[PDB]
Symmetry: C3
Subunit: 56 residues, 3 copies
Amino acid sequence: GSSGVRLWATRQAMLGQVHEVPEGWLIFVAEQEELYVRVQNGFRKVQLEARTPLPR
Amino acid sequence: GSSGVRLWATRQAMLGQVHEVPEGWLIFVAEQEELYVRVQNGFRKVQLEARTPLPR
Amino acid sequence: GSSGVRLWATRQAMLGQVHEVPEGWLIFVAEQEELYVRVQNGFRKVQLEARTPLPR
């Protein structure tokens, strides 16, 4: 099957809808700059490194 | 270019189709709750943290 | 809100277009086998593990 990536502006908006995200979808929250994957009965944060700036 | 995220229920199901998944696609296997990225001649596991529960 | 995954052959190619990738998209660079997520004013590398070979 196929899933994809969903994003919300804030972790707050994301939590309001996370029950409705299917397992296997990635979830990004823009304010906090955090990435997770939805799993059975929860979600697991993806380890990210420091921000690399955009090229000049 | 654009890729996406593919999803399978189990390890065996994913291993059976992985040759046909192009590089740069993410792969989620629900049973193991593991996420990978397809790379040249194989795939690399994405490091995940412990499960965060869904809000009550 | 949904995003997705974009890929490029090389890091140089990706850097050429990364301003036009929206926040919350994942970015894969094939030659370097690196995975990032686009964030405010930059991009963050995703921690990957060693390559698992494709099944026999």
